[PDB]
Structures are given as structure tokens and as C-alpha cells.
Amino acid sequence: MEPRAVADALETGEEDVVMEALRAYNRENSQSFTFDDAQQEDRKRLAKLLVSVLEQGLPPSRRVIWLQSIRILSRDRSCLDSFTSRRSLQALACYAGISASEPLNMDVVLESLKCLCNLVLSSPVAQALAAEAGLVVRLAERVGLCRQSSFPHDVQFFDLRLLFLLTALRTDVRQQLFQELQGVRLLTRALELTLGHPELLPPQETERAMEILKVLFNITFDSIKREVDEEDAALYRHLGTLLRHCVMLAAAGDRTEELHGHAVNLLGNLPVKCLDVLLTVNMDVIRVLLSFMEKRLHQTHRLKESVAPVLSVLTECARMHRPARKFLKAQVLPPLRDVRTRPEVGELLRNKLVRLMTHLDTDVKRVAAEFLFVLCSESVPRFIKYTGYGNAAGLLAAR
């Protein structure tokens, strides 16, 4: 019932009573991540006892109830440091099957992955220990299996989430997954196998694909040089074809906008040349991207992170393709009939973009200015006529 009671049971208790106490605690606290700051010493003692039992070795019959219990104690930042040790993380990686050093229960694997993700997300010591242990190698191996791997959606999704956490918090793990393991091709293959040409995407496949896109965004944004080779170019073109399929794909559960957002954020980091696959008149992909941008313009709090990647992608598309530039100019800047209305007055797309040119974020200002500049075929008088001096001064002073 109480943490001190369970800790005293685990200290002085037989085989059945400790398991019954942990079972009753897990059943009654499976929906509780917060704890009162009064039983903190008892919780720390229980956590240290559980860590001592974990480093010693758990019996194969008593793991699911144990790890889950640990998960309940992983929800406490005070007890968090009691679990973050090299021996404890080695035991967790061995129970998760990701240690470099036997049958496997999928519930055990899932609970171990949940505990590892909770520790890495909450402890820099835990994320550094995971970086030192090199769990990313075996994680990438298990993910790249994919074909003969009949692992459940929970295990796959939490492997992807652990990869996301490791590549977001540890730059060394991020670079090791990109350069040494060549994780770009592995994740591209995993995304291609996750998509299969189905009309709708299931919820499990949608979650897994969004996690793959997040990991790709974490590993590909500052690791690609300006000039690439033929193999990397072909791999990025295949990834761009997959992302174009995603943009033209709808996801179930009303997650299609989130999936398109993740795919566009991933597109925003690819080499500009590799954007040639967005066109292979036939501007359906560009129309979907423009509609996505027009819908994302309604965001005000997260406006930058919402519309910067799509605006950059459309800017690079209009810069590298004359037909795409003409199409975007015809769809955004039509020939003006009545020139009495100011560019900063109105609720049209042009007026919204002009108001965004005076946003509080200089990055948003410059991105919108460059986008509207490459739409006017890089014509200074046309850009000043469509936008106005009060809005184009930021771009004019930048160059």
C-alpha cells in the first residue's frame, strides 16, 4: 500500500509477499506519475533496494512486475539518480536485448525500453551512460532487421523513441548513427518498408513513420555538406521520393497534418539539388505543400517552427525550377487589378505574408522576404511593388 511498507516488505520478506506487494502497488499506481513530497526518503530507499536487486540479477519468472515497478519509481526525479548507474543500465540493456554482452519476453523488452526512455529523457547522466555503452548500435541493428523481424508495434515504436531521445540529447550518438553506422540509408529503408501503395496509413504505422522522421531530422540537419557524392545523392533522392509519397499520403486518426509537418521538416534539411524529386503541369505536390503552408499560417505561438521549413522548401523549389517559380507566382502573387489596396492591408495570402514580413522574429521576416523575392523571379522592382518598402527594407538591408 504505502512506499515505506513496500520497502520494509522487500527488506524483510519472503518470495511470495514481496511479489504480492509489488503487484498490488503496480495495480494501484499504474495511473500515477506524481507523488507527495513526504515519502521521499522511503521512495529513495526502495529505489536503492530495487537497484541492488537489479544489479544482482532478476529471475526470469519475476521481471515484468519488477521492471514496471521500477518504471513507477522512474517517475520520480528524486529517485531517478538511484537508478542511473552503469551496472543498472547494463542490466536494463541486457533485459532489453540491446547490450553488446537467450529467450526474450516482449513485455520484458517493452518495459525495459520504457524505463530506458524515461531515464534518458530525465537524466543527463543516464543519456551519457547510454552514449558510453553504445546501445545505439544494437538499436539500429534491431531497427534495420525489419524484414525477418516480427517484433510488435510497441517494441518498434519505443526503439524509435529511444533512438530519437539518444540522437536529440547526445551529439556523439547522433554523429555515430550518421557517419559510422550509415543510419540514413537504414532509416530510409525502414520508412520505405513502413509505407509499403496503401491509400490510408494505419495508426501504428503513422506513429512509427513519424518517429522515423523525427530521428532522421535529429541526425540530418548539420551533418550534410554543401556538395554530396553520387551515392549520397541517390539515397537522398530515394528519401525525397518517400517523403513526396508521404506528403501525398493521408494518415488515419487525423494525424495527416502532423505527418506532413514532420515530412516537410525533414525535407527542409535535405540538399537543395535533391529537391528535384518533388517535381518528377504536374504540380500536385507543390499544391499540397502550398495548402499545408496556408493552413500552418494560422499558428501564432509556434509560427516559426511551423512555417519556416515549408517556406524554405518552397523557396528552394522556386529558385531551382522556373516552372515551379511561375506556378507559385501565379498562385501567390496574381496580376493586380485594383492597386488602391495596400499590401499590408487585407486578409488574403499576400496580406498575411506581408504582415509576417513584419513579425517579431527576424528569421521569419527574412524567410518570408526571400520566399517572396524568389517568387518574383528575383526582380527587385517587382518585389518592391508587391511587398512595399516598409516590408522589403529588411531584405534590402540584409544584402
Author numbering: 1 to 101, 107 to 201, 208 to 291, 304 to 422
The authors write:
Notable among these are the resistance to inhibitors of cholinesterase 8 (Ric8) proteins, which regulate G-protein biology in species ranging from slime molds to vertebrates and, in contrast to GPCRs, act on monomeric Gα subunits. The interaction of Ric8 with GDP-bound Gα stimulates release of GDP, leading to the formation of a stable intermediate complex of Ric8 and nucleotide-free Gα. Although the GEF activity of Ric8A and Ric8B was initially thought to account for the ability of these proteins to positively regulate G-protein signaling, mounting evidence suggests that the Ric8 proteins can also serve as ubiquitous chaperones for Gα-subunits.
As in the case for Ric8A within the complex, only a subset of the Ric8A1–492 residues (Ric8A1–422) could be modeled based on the electron density, suggesting that the C-terminal tail of Ric8A is flexible. Furthermore, comparison of the two structures shows that the binding of MBP-Gαt327–350 to Ric8A does not cause major conformational changes to its core domain, Ric8A1–422. Although residues 400–422 of Ric8A form a two-helix hairpin, their orientation and packing differ from those that characterize the armadillo fold. Moreover, in the structures of apo Ric8A1–492 and Ric8A1–492/MBP-Gαt327–350 conformations of the hairpin are nearly identical despite the different crystal packing interactions that involve residues 400–422. This suggests that the contacts within the crystal lattice are not responsible for termination of the armadillo fold after R8.
